[PDB]
């Protein structure tokens, strides 16, 4: 069974064919018709199994059938644990709703708070939101959420692990419950995701597992590379590594969609032939660029960590991790496996600052071996002078330089491993120096004894 | 008139109504007083009298009515300023519980 034979609207069907997706992946095939009927479902899928398309199809279909307008407010809420997974969901939702008249928007941590309230006040029908800033908007901002019809909880296990316990419970209290669809997607079935399910879902779920029980977690047959690199010289290391190890296969990882776009236009101005894979391209372009990479012999793909979870990495010689990784269990184990690539001799390295040497202690505690990689000072191609000249005189590449810098810092602060990676040991001057700036652009890092005779509040109206 | 009959008390005025009622507790702690007699006026016409013991003790709300003070010339009586009173209470003050904690205040 395929996308055509399930009866969709002509606006939904035409946008579906524009992406090139025809064949239903397994979770979409058996969870979209139950959600279209109106039954709440549970999903035990893995990130990148097409599950992002699995809840947006019933969400978009109900918006068009109920004929939502901006004055009716939010119809669907999709809760995503981190920023760049929400930015991927917002990317596919834009391709979905290209023929529709509904409105999509994104609420994320580190974004402009009072610009988002004006975005919400005008009317956003489909809202993808981080649970932290969702609760801030729900308690403080005036916008319509009284016509909500579906709630999506995407990677519910990752939401609980980050520490959004109290935010999840306060959200299900404030959002309306009567005649509401609910979806709960997760990977591992912990006890905490059971309490989240029993308080958000209707009393009869429709649960499906396809969770990969054959997790070949190897603790010995693995090897991880790492470079100690100064904060202001990380791009110069990436540039020198790519130009000297050119005519080879290299996959490089980043942390944000904005940084991938900025470094794509940088390397073309500096004349390195390199392929990019970020969220703002069309979906058909992404499959063409990945297929052209797989049946290539040499070259480089720039792609974020989040897009490469659901991506089947071909035989590559080098796996490059420029930014801190999203899930280090995902990182160390699986891309360490795909670095070996069955028979090939492939290696994977991790860029580390001197302020991130605590990752080594976690490596030694997990008993998985490491290999140092060192650089001479005469191999770094010092092109900082012409990089600063190009940023200071080109306005498009300056705009992408600010966006890549802000998206890197915001992702650094919203990291699970706060001990190894936190923003307060970064120096922003050297971080912006690598991004191409003389002076750092402004960012927000942050984004008992009580009163005498003060008793708790017995009652009253508060707002 | 009341503060002329309590030598163990001190006067204050212009307390911000937009402040919190437990900042009255901070105010009397600053001035070293364990009781407060608070006059709250509504509309510039309605008087509400608060009695409390400042750190932890109970609090009573009243609504004052039918006010007459010493400046009226028909009273024809006078007492030594700061002299010790004879407090006269009622039988119903003694029996009933909520008036009995009021008599303590």
């Amino acid at each position: 069974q395929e996308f055509s034979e399930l009866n969709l609207s002509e606006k939904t069907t035409k946008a579906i064919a524009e992406m090139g997706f025809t064949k239903m992946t397994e979770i979409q095939r058996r969870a979209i018709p139950p959600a279209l009927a109106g039954k709440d479902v549970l999903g035990a899928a893995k990130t990148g199994s097409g599950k992002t398309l699995a809840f947006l199809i019933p969400a978009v279909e109900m918006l068009s059938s109920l004929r939502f307008k901006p004055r009716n407010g939010t119809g669907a809420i999709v809760v995503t644990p981190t920023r760049e997974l929400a930015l991927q969901i917002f990317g596919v939702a834009r391709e979905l709703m290209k023929y529709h008249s509904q409105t999509y928007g994104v609420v994320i941590g580190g974004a402009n708070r009072r610009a988002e309230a004006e975005k919400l006040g005008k009317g956003v029908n489909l809202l993808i939101a981080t649970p932290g800033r969702l609760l801030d908007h729900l308690q403080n901002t005036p916008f319509v959420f009284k016509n909500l019809k579906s709630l999506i909880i995407d990677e519910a296990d990752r939401i609980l692990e980050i520490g959004f316990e109290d935010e999840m419970r306060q959200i299900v209290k404030i959002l309306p419950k009567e005649d509401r669809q609910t979806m709960l997607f997760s990977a591992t079935q912990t006890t905490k995701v059971e309490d989240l399910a029993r308080i958000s879902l209707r009393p009869g779920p429709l649960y499906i597992n396809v969770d990969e029980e054959k997790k070949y977690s190897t603790v010995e047959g693995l090897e991880q590379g790492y470079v100690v690199v100064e904060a202001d010289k990380r791009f110069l290391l990436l540039f020198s590594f790519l130009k000297k190890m050119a005519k080879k296969k290299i996959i490089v990882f980043f942390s944000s969609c904005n940084s991938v776009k900025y470094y794509s236009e940088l390397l073309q101005y500096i004349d390195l032939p390199v392929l990019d894979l970020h969220g703002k391209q069309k979906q058909q372009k992404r499959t063409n660029t990945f297929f052209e990479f797989c049946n290539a012999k040499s070259g480089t793909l720039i792609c974020t960590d989040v897009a490469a979870r659901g991506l089947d990495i071909p035989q590559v010689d080098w796996i490059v991790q420029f930014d801190p990784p999203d899930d280090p269990r995902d990182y160390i184990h699986r891309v360490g496996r795909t670095a070996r690539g069955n028979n090939g001799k492939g290696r994977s390295l991790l860029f580390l600052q001197p302020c991130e040497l605590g990752f080594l202690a976690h490596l030694k505690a997990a008993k998985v071996p490491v290999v140092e990689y060192d650089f001479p000072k005469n191999k770094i191609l010092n092109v900082q002078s012409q990089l600063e000249k190009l940023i200071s005189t080109n306005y498009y590449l300056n705009q992408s330089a600010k966006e890549g810098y802000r998206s890197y810092i915001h992702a650094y602060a919203s990291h699970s491993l706060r001990s190894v990676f936190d923003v307060h040991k970064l120096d922003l001057v050297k971080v912006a120096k690598s991004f191409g700036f003389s002076t750092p652009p402004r960012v927000d890092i942050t984004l008992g004894r009580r009163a005498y005779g003060s008793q708790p509040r017995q009652g009253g109206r508060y707002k | 008139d009341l503060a002329s009959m309590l030598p163990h008390g001190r006067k204050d005025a212009k307390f911000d109504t937009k402040s919190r009622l437990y900042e009255l507790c901070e105010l009397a702690e600053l001035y070293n007083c364990n009781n407060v007699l608070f006059f709250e006026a509504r509309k510039g016409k309605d008087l509400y009298m608060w009695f409390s013991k400042v750190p932890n003790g109970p609090t009573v709300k009243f609504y004052a009515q039918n006010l007459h003070t010493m400046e009226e010339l028909h009273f024809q009586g006078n007492c030594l300023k700061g002299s010790r009173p004879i407090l006269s209470f009622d039988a119903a003050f003694e029996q009933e519980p909520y008036l009995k904690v009021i008599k303590e205040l």
């Binding site: 269990r329 202690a361 008992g448 009580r450 005498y452 | -």
Partner: peptide, 29 residues
């Protein structure tokens, strides 16, 4: 001393706390 492999390591007052007449929370300063 990192016991678990890669999760975060786990990491005054002027009053006394005692219950009130409605079975709630009150304070003695």
């Amino acid at each position: 001393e990192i016991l678990e492999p890669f999760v975060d390591p786990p990491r005054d007052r002027n009053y006394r706390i005692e219950k009130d007449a409605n079975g709630g929370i009150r304070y003695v300063y």
